[PDB]
Design a protein around this nucleic acid. Structure first.
Ligand SMILES: [Mg+2]
Ligand SMILES: [Mg+2]
Ligand SMILES: [Mg+2]
Ligand SMILES: [Mg+2]
Ligand SMILES: [Mg+2]
Ligand SMILES: [Mg+2]
Ligand SMILES: [Mg+2]
Ligand SMILES: [Mg+2]
Ligand SMILES: [Mg+2]
Ligand SMILES: [Mg+2]
Ligand SMILES: [Mg+2]
Ligand SMILES: [Mg+2]
Lengths: 313, 307, 306, 317, 305, 314
DNA sequence: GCACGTAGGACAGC
DNA sequence: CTGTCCTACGTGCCA
């Protein structure tokens, strides 16, 4: 009877390694999500910020974003967004690139109660605030709890890092946020879904490998977005699907012998799309690995001249 | 039966001296033109490029731009634009911010025939080319006249510099461009209107003082846009009205004595808008002039420790 | 006090011209070193044949230098004697042992090492040929002279001694003076036993160099010795032998179904992909070729006879 | 001369090469190298570019390794940074095999990419790569363009390579001259003759071999002399005028053509005149052979052909 | 003793710094001062390593002084050798060096010559200043000298160049360029340099006056003048080399930043025995005060701030 | 005989480099060295040099070499030499020295009197350097003092380097009536040969030893360049006792090529030359490339090209 | 299908 | 008894 999508951190227009192919990769994976959300046709899409990677994004990025969210709004899919760190103006009077989506998307900086078929469900959220302004936020957060006291299904949207989920730094502590049915969170690029307070907290995670860390969460959790159903009166992890998205493959290598060289080539041959390779290659195997340049997107491996006597337990 | 607007070089989002106020100024003068164009309700608006000052212009610039061209298209005014030096991509696959206006505007890189009341009229244009590709351009230009041979009222749109009107550099020589009724030109920020070939050539000029030099052309010719009627079969200067737009005034000073100082105070009081001051002021007169810093936009004046 | 006696690694030896085999040698060597590093003895005595050639592969050299650096950085003093393989042949030719000069003391005489907290006398010399036995005897007698007033004395040599190796040998058992411990090398089988009121040892090679060494690996095991020499006297009881896993070799004689099953059983029972050698009847050839994925190399002779 | 910047371009020492199976010749190669090294230490440049073939073999004799390691240590200890590219001789063949260049890892930077060196007080871009074959020229072009890309916004750019370039060596060659982008200096090796000349908007150089490795190198030894280059690169532009060529004393070779008393006496004169027992080669008439056999003590090795022919050849003037 | 000889260079006759009569006179006077001491010494040979004149066409007075000097030196049956410096070297073909005017008193060196002194026989070779560009030629030139000196025991080389260790930028030759000679009579380097080199001893006589603003302190540390080697015995070393220094114009450096540094200025300036040249930096506030004593000073061309 | 003879030479302008040509600078040298040679062939008793030996105050070194080479050779043959400083050789700045100074050991620079005793007579010489017109006053006083000391002398010679009013219209430093009665007037500042009786005696300008300005050529053809050879054997001297030594020097041909004739006259005149001539004058544009055929035959072409079509028909 | 080096076996010793 | 032959085969270039 009801379903909604939690996505965030697309970082539209990010250009890793200054590679054209990569800027494309970000766009494509985004469009892939949009296609899937259009295939799913949920009632709501919660977007937890960092739609754009920059404050003044390339025209292609804006074209795609506007193109996409128009297509969603035309399919009677309601979309809520909170501005991420990257989308927050710095000069006075400066506008967010999110402003271009004003006609297809609701930018959240307060409460809103949305009536779906056939239920009535409460949403509140706010833009990215700094660690500096945490005090400011607490009042805002408490005012949200206040107006949500009498609501059964209440969703909170935020673009911050919460203390256990992100070492240093973080803007909020986990005991800072009130009881909500679902926590649509965004600033953290790894996939996080788990019970919290008396409900369920979530980071949708980035939709492509944006920064240097995300390599293992790609294999371990996969990148994409969440699809919460919220059909019944209760919600648990059991009613939350993770939609995965194919994106640029990264293979990590540690070529030190004939075996590790072949394991590398196997991993590379097995890739559907020309991978980004990283890790370490011993000097002695370097020119031999250079034979795979046709089969590889870019080689970001450190070359090691050192002769190690490393032996296993 | 027909009238149309030639505007160009608004340079949206240019932020002169890194000043907030200057970026506003540019917005303001643009939005004024749009209001005045709406008060006029012409049939066509020809925009000869450099609409945005940047390739990835600020968000406010894009919102202003889209709202403006929406407001024009919803009033059934057809708009043509050609991309200027500033709106042209560098990388392959980089897109022009003009593309964000695709829904209200025809971006020209070829011909198009527009049917007015009750006439049929030929328009063609192309984006900004470099001097380097002049040969390429000649081919393009010759093909336009060919496709226009049997047309009586023909308008050509370009965003280039033409050799007599701008010594160095320029991309085309004036004898490069074929016979057309009207030349909708851009890239030269001063107002230029004069007869040419067997028709009438125009540079609409910038809609605000972009560089410090264009200041006197504001004083001397005035900045804004053109309103050509093109009602009869022939068109002449008599049928071209120039719409002016008030914009930020600049004051030049050379204060070494009481005379030039008093002239300075006079001109500053004489200004309608808090002026941008530049020129020379003697070191000794420095603390005396700082009394008007609240009464002035910005002080970009040179200090002279001698004369 | 404690010390390690190792020898005959034959670094860079490439048996059957096999990549995997040259590796095997490196690997077992690096492993002894790791094991030596986990133990952290005071001294490491190396009785020669570290390298298999005078101009060993770059990797072998690279590995060796790293190894002894790591040992020297852990304040373990290392003595080595030049083996037959490490001895220059044309005049002016240099030994690959020279590349280790900064981590290792190459022995051609005496040296007294002060440990915590004992004082102990070491002597040794490079590999001499049979030809120079006369020469060597004097050298040994010169050692005995300088060691008379010393309590704990070790002799390092890389030779074959007459009883321990039928043919050939450079010294007779009665050629060598009385020492506490005879740190010897050049015989690839493990030899440890009391001798001349002391204890004589060949550490044995650290990998299967010749196909002959095949059974002594299973029967005695390859690696090195760990002598402590803590007390005033030392006996076999205070010598630990560290074993090393290495390449297994299977012998075959396939002429019927029995010997075939003995072979496949022996091969599957192997921990590391085996080297097979021996005799196989021609009629069994394509049938045996089914196991190449489970085998390193097949050096068996094919027999067209009845 | 100075400077804010200076560097030495050396290559092709072929350490451990043993020509004619002569101990003496093997020594010669060693000696001349050491002499280059000594001269560099007296010069004290900021950088030393070595364009490969330091060693003649993949598994070089121990003496060569010690001499080599000693040399680059002594250079590194005097804070001269050394960049090297792998020559044909130093490229591993079996998979996993190591280059003897690896033994210099701590004193030398092996180039297979870009690197920007900060000198006092200038900033200069260096790039290079190991030896590629003709077979992999395509592979190489992409890499070379990648250098051109990464050097455009750089002022001083040096390219290091160990290949033969098409005009400079008819057949064979791995690259064509139009393959390589504009660089300030082309630090090249693999052609054992001394080559220096302007090229593109810059200057291309072969340091040449530091001793007579193959039997061909004779005349360029006499005409150009073997050793290395010393470029200063102090100013923003560089021309030949700012490139000094350091010569090196090495084993003398005399070419002889003994056909009469004159040519015989001229042979003996050149040989007696030699500082070091020369390698004699060329032609000796049969009739003069046993007479020349008197000088075997005075000669390193005699590689001259004996000619039985009686020529009635006569010159005009 | 039985034998002695002199090494001098870089007088730069006719240099007129800041267009001052007194400066050009100073150079002259100091040159003539050097000449006086050479006459007091009475050596067997006099070696001059170039840059005697500052230009190829020097003023007539400079030409007069020089000729007069060497006339006075040649008349004592003292042999003199010279090699052409950078400044004395012709540009057009057919253009002559002013040294040519001294042919009657002097031997200009561009090759070998064996001189018999009392009572020994000694080998001299040298050549003029070559450019960096022509280093190759020079090496060949040098190689031919070594050849003709191999069988000679006492061999002296005369050159006017910068050698790589002794002068970073620029130099024409590297120190390993020059063969073993008994004495390296060098020029073009205005600072005093004397030290052993190869199997012998290399020397730069240094300028006889302060040409550039740099040379002020090197006059204090090494002293300016020329070298006097005897070479009577079989061996040569520093032990047999006396250096005659010559009194010349004092230079004062200033940095007036407070009353103290000003007082330090007055102390050093009043300390000048000879009408001083003042240079350096002066604070805006302190300009007029020395003008009370400006009559007591030669010229104030200190950096303008 | 005789008992006495001497040479009057002047204005060699040594180191002059006309048209910036190596050959011209050489020519000046060559003609000078030739004179010295002829003087040595002659072996006169005295040499009077009326100034302008050098062309500048700072002459090129080659010039100084050649000059000194010459006067030493003259002084060593026991020929005493007197010289006066020309316009060119007189210092301007205070303390500046004359290039004449470099010749002190072979030559006497005159700025006063000196009596030289010959075999077996006693004869008076006086002279002075070049003074400007402005300093004529000084000079007249100087001159009265010269006439005064020579009154009781029978053989008295005057050396000057000036232009005298009739012999040179404008400008001149002295009037002809400015100089006193002397046996011989050794004069120099005028490059043309002038010899004539004057004040019961004889005045002479030796003239330049080469064509310094483009004008002097026809004066060379008509009078010839070189020096004078005076004997002064009797108490009086007249033209009869003055031999004029001529010197071959660089020929200059003037052309005025306007027609076929004038062109042919040009080619003839050039071919007739012993030495590749300096050509000057006018050549019509139309004849330029036809005249370019003679480049091998010519030292330098300094003719104006006239494109103008003149109706010049007298 | 080729080439190349290493290994491995053997024969020559003044 | 070092030296060097010969043959055999692993491994990579390649077509
Ligand atoms: Mg983010
Ligand atoms: Mg974020
Ligand atoms: Mg423009
Ligand atoms: Mg514009
Ligand atoms: Mg062994
Ligand atoms: Mg052994
Ligand atoms: Mg090579
Ligand atoms: Mg080579
Ligand atoms: Mg000099
Ligand atoms: Mg000098
Ligand atoms: Mg005159
Ligand atoms: Mg004259």
């Amino acid at each position: 009877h009801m379903m909604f999508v939690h996505i965030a951190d697309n970082h539209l227009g990010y250009r890793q390694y200054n590679l054209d192919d990569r800027e494309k990769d970000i766009y494509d994976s985004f469009k892939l999500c949009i296609k899937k959300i259009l295939e799913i046709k949920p009632d709501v899409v919660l977007h937890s910020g960092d739609l754009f990677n920059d404050l003044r994004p390339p025209v292609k990025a804006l074209r795609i974003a506007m193109q996409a969210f128009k297509k969603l709004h035309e399919n009677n899919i309601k979309v809520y967004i909170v501005a991420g760190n990257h989308e927050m103006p710095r000069r006075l009077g400066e506008e967010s690139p999110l402003a271009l989506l004003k006609d297809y998307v609701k930018i959240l900086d307060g409460k809103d109660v949305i009536n779906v078929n056939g239920e009535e469900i409460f949403i509140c959220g706010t833009y990215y605030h700094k660690k500096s302004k945490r005090e400011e936020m607490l009042d805002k957060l408490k005012n949200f709890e206040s107006e949500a006291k009498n609501y059964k299904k209440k969703i909170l949207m935020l673009h911050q890092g919460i203390n256990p989920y992100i070492p240093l730094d973080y803007e909020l502590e986990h005991f800072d946020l009130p009881k909500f049915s679902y926590y649509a969170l965004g600033h953290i690029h790894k996939r996080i879904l788990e019970r919290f307070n008396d409900g369920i907290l979530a980071y949708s995670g980035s939709t492509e490998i944006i920064y240097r860390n995300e390599y293992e969460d790609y294999k371990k959790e996969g990148k994409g977005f969440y699809l919460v159903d919220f059909s019944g009166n209760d919600l648990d992890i059991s009613d939350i699907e993770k939609i995965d998205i194919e994106c640029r493959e990264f293979v990590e290598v540690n070529i030190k012998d004939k075996k590790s060289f072949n394991e590398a080539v196997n991993k590379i041959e097995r890739c559907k799309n020309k991978p980004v390779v990283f890790g370490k290659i011993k000097r002695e195997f370097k020119p031999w690995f250079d034979t795979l340049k046709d089969k590889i997107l870019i080689n970001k491996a450190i070359i090691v001249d050192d002769e190690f006597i490393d032996m296993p337990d």
